[PDB]
């Protein structure tokens with residue numbers, strides 16, 4: 001385990017997702033409101049899944065070697081298994097907040113699936129130049145998601161409760177900034193151009209992941225917006 | 232096929248899931264009620280999926296060799312492919328019975344996914360001691376599911392029709408007893424401590440599977456609880 | 463890339479799915495109706511997914527070699543990854559058109575999953591004779607889907623708006639004819655009996671895919687049936 005310099009960030013990531021999971025689980029114990037239960041369910045599942053996949057990376061299961069550039073390159077494939085489930089869940093949190101129509105939810109989740117799936121293919125592609133073709137397609141899918149979060153959702157929120165509008169706005173901004181960093185880290189890290197070494201890359205992803213999941217969740221679950229308006 | 236002593240239980244399992252599938256399909260032919268159609272759909276799909284995966288194990292496709300303990304260990308991975316889809320379907324049957332809120336359904340299905348996914352990782356893990364780490368996490372996810380089935384669902388059922396309350400109670404009890412045996416069999420069988428040989432392990436899983444799927448389905452689909460109250 | 467004679471059909475397929483995707487995306491820009499948004503979302507996702515998987519086949523990622531018949535046989539596994547997601551989406555388009563009950567939708571999607579999953583197992587099976595066992599099970603699942611599209615849906619459509627009835631009828635007929643060709647092509651092509659060479663097989667699948675996705679989508683998205691009745 002300790003033979004990989006990035007182990008420390010995997011261990012920290014595992015611990016923080018674990019602690020985040022336990023905290024949200026305990027916090028959601030005293031919740032009977034059906035709307036709030038949905039948000040607690042979605043939001044607690046996110047670090048729970050991330051916990052399992054961080055642990056899989058820490059123990060070495062979620063790592064494979066991919067030959068490109070005439071080298072055996074360590075690729076943590078478990079990230080994509082995580083993101084495949086957790087990024088649509090995060091989008092669902094946002095979509096449910098603003099009472100998105102079903103068509104838009106399907107568009108988001110579908111685009112997200114394409115984003116992660118093509119990122120995975122890019123990560124495992126042995127022809128070096130083609131890795132960036134997949135990166136570009138995945139990034140286009142991300143750009144679509146970001147467009148919808150801004151020019152389909154933000155104007156929907158203004159027509160809703162002020163607490164849901166303000167909470168959505170914060171979470172939207174957090175999401176757009178944090179999510180946009182991922183293709184950059186991939187591009188310059190071990191999966192892409194290889195300018196940033198894997199240990200630093202792992203640190204960067206860990207900071208992004210904890211912020212995008214536990215940070216996000218802390219903001220969401222402390223908000224009154226997740227409760228139905230009741231007396 | 233006959234070169235594996237466990238083939239007989241795989242063959243029997245295949246036949247019983249097949250027959251179970253055909254029986255539920257025929258039985259559901261004369262059903263127009265929209266609620267009953269949901270239960271027939273869910274409940275017929277369960278042995279249909281199990282049929283395909285038993286057949287895959289029988290024909291040898293759903294088997295791989297995993298090196299641990301300095302041995303090549305036969306691991307039937309197809310079980311997890313089965314359970315990944317059939318256990319949430321079984322939980323959906325229960326959840327729909329008691330008209331569970333969406334948040335609770337998501338919690339159940341999500342926990343179930345974690346249960347099966349981590350069981351799969353445990354099954355394929357090459358570091359012997361780590362297999363039991365995954366077993367423990369999976370078992371914790373199972374315990375969460377069982378907690379919800381008792382302390383989130385049972386009190387919901389009492390507020391519903393007597394036929395749905397009584398049927399849920401029976402199916403809940405069947406589910407908790409049968410499902411709890413699976414981590415025990417895994418732990419002592421070829422995936423875990425290796426005390427019980429694979430042929431007996433396969434027998435045990437076959438008895439559990441047929442009971443948890445066809446047995447469960449027979450109880451559910453004979454009940455009046457799957458029909459909306461109509462005149 | 464050009465080393466495989468079928469590359470031309472993969473390239474054409476990629477281009478046509480890409481163009482189809484862009485066309486539906488642009489066309490759906492000026493849509494606010496919640497019902498129409500659902501259909502645009504579903505129908506645009508279908509060629510988008512197919513685009514990615516055609517590209518994966520073109521670049522060689524979505525190809526593996528399967529030993530059977532004492533030969534190394536090129537099997538494009540990416541087709542199943544495509545179909546796993548796009549065929550239920552296509553069925554959802556049809557089901558939503560006729561306002562299918564949830565039980566029937568689950569039956570369709572479930573049968574479809576079995577159809578594609580067993581086709582995949584058949585495609586990767588190393589025992590030649592067993593490949594056709596999987597083909598038969600998959601074809602039985604297809605026959606179930608076709609039965610439901612005719613003897614569960616058609617009589618539902620007649621009870622609905624004339625525009626939805628007529629559009630459903632056309633799309634149903636297109637779907638039944640086109641989908642039925644797939645098991646035939648598989649059976650006689652490289653996955654099955656090997657009578658038709660892979661380059662021609664790839665052409666046939668490309669024509670079917672573009673017709674079943676872009677052709678289908680063009681018919682659906684030009685129809686008034688995807689809009690709620692409004693003044």
Ligand SMILES: CC(C)CCC[C@@H](C)CCC[C@@H](C)CCC[C@@H](C)CCOC[C@@H](CO)OCC[C@H](C)CCC[C@H](C)CCC[C@H](C)CCCC(C)C
Nearest residue numbers: 109110113114117118120121124511514526539542543547
């Ligand atoms: C609505 C939305 C959800 C839509 C989703 C968008 C989605 C279509 C985007 C593309 C997803 C697709 C790329 C997933 C591919 C998974 C693949 C990387 C798994 C690894 O297999 C790749 C090679 C080794 O590199 O296997 C060696 C060859 C082996 C023989 C491989 C054979 C097994 C195949 C992998 C079977 C395909 C199953 C499905 C791809 C499962 C989906 C997995 C998940 C990652 C989407």
Ligand SMILES: CC(C)CCC[C@@H](C)CCC[C@@H](C)CCC[C@@H](C)CCOC[C@@H](CO)OCC[C@H](C)CCC[C@H](C)CCC[C@H](C)CCCC(C)C
Nearest residue numbers: 049052064077080081085340341344345348349351352355
């Ligand atoms: C809401 C709920 C549904 C949440 C679900 C909870 C879920 C997160 C729990 C964990 C699921 C995750 C462990 C699934 C892992 C699948 C993996 C075992 C497949 C086999 O690949 C493992 C190694 C060989 O041992 O592959 C050799 C290396 C290869 C290069 C592997 C690369 C391909 C990757 C497998 C791509 C990942 C795709 C997804 C994991 C598909 C999910 C499969 C299913 C089993 C969940």
Ligand SMILES: CC(C)CCC[C@@H](C)CCC[C@@H](C)CCC[C@@H](C)CCOC[C@@H](CO)OCC[C@H](C)CCC[C@H](C)CCC[C@H](C)CCCC(C)C
Nearest residue numbers: 280283295308311312316571572575576579580582583586
């Ligand atoms: C409600 C509906 C959706 C129901 C769906 C119906 C469905 C049950 C029908 C059967 C699906 C099932 C056959 C999928 C099998 C995927 C499998 C082909 C992936 C490739 O792995 C096969 C072998 C190499 O040939 O791997 C070499 C051995 C490796 C060690 C394999 C270990 C990893 C396993 C693949 C883990 C299983 C994960 C799930 C099968 C993911 C589903 C993938 C998708 C194709 C259904």
Ligand SMILES: *C/C=C(C)/C=C/C=C(C)/C=C/C1=C(C)CCCC1(C)C
Nearest residue numbers: 119135138139142179182183186212
């Ligand atoms: C909790 C984890 C999160 C929120 C991860 C989000 C990941 C992304 C937004 C990844 C995007 C990528 C691209 C846009 C292209 C390059 C490859 C990816 C997958 C890193």
Ligand SMILES: *C/C=C(C)/C=C/C=C(C)/C=C/C1=C(C)CCCC1(C)C
Nearest residue numbers: 350366369370373410413414417443
């Ligand atoms: C129809 C099949 C059923 C109902 C199978 C259920 C399986 C489980 C409840 C399995 C649980 C496991 C654990 C709790 C940890 C050990 C590994 C598993 C996957 C066997």
Ligand SMILES: *C/C=C(C)/C=C/C=C(C)/C=C/C1=C(C)CCCC1(C)C
Nearest residue numbers: 581597600601604641644645648674
């Ligand atoms: C857009 C792609 C479409 C509509 C593909 C549809 C594919 C099928 C209907 C495939 C059916 C098969 C069988 C019925 C058995 C043989 C194997 C398959 C998977 C080709």
Ligand SMILES: CCCCCCCCCCCCCCC
Nearest residue numbers: 181184185188195196197200204
């Ligand atoms: C979106 C964040 C991308 C910026 C990443 C900056 C990382 C700087 C770390 C120094 C690079 C290490 C190179 C020498 C080993």
Ligand SMILES: CCCCCCCCCCCCCC
Nearest residue numbers: 084085088089092105109113
């Ligand atoms: C490929 C995995 C996609 C599924 C991710 C799980 C989250 C799905 C959320 C469903 C949103 C509801 C749409 C109507």
Ligand SMILES: CCCCCCCCCCCCCC
Nearest residue numbers: 315316319320323336340344
């Ligand atoms: C990883 C596979 C999970 C999907 C299993 C299929 C059953 C899902 C049931 C969905 C329940 C509805 C939730 C609102």
Ligand SMILES: CCCCCCCCCCCCCC
Nearest residue numbers: 546547550551554567571575
């Ligand atoms: C194995 C992949 C199955 C999921 C395919 C995605 C489409 C699912 C459509 C869901 C229909 C809604 C059912 C209530």
Ligand SMILES: CCCCCCCCCCCCC
Nearest residue numbers: 139143146147150180183184
């Ligand atoms: C085009 C949609 C406008 C809002 C999205 C902001 C785009 C941020 C660019 C991210 C950079 C990724 C490499």
Ligand SMILES: CCCCCCCCCCCCC
Nearest residue numbers: 370374377378381411414415
């Ligand atoms: C803690 C929830 C109470 C109901 C669940 C019963 C737990 C049964 C233990 C199963 C043993 C698994 C090894």
Ligand SMILES: CCCCCCCCCCCCC
Nearest residue numbers: 601605608609612642645646
């Ligand atoms: C049995 C359902 C009647 C409508 C389905 C038509 C069946 C077409 C046969 C397709 C041939 C596949 C090999």
Ligand SMILES: CCCCCCCCCCC
Nearest residue numbers: 128129130132133134136
């Ligand atoms: C070896 C790198 C070759 C450059 C490939 C860049 C492709 C990026 C695609 C963006 C449209």
Ligand SMILES: CCCCCCCCCCC
Nearest residue numbers: 140141143144147490491
């Ligand atoms: C393929 C990238 C798409 C980003 C621009 C958005 C196009 C308009 C979409 C309107 C729903």
Ligand SMILES: CCCCCCCCCCC
Nearest residue numbers: 359360361363364365367
């Ligand atoms: C070789 C066996 C070593 C014991 C591992 C047991 C781990 C179980 C984890 C329960 C918390």
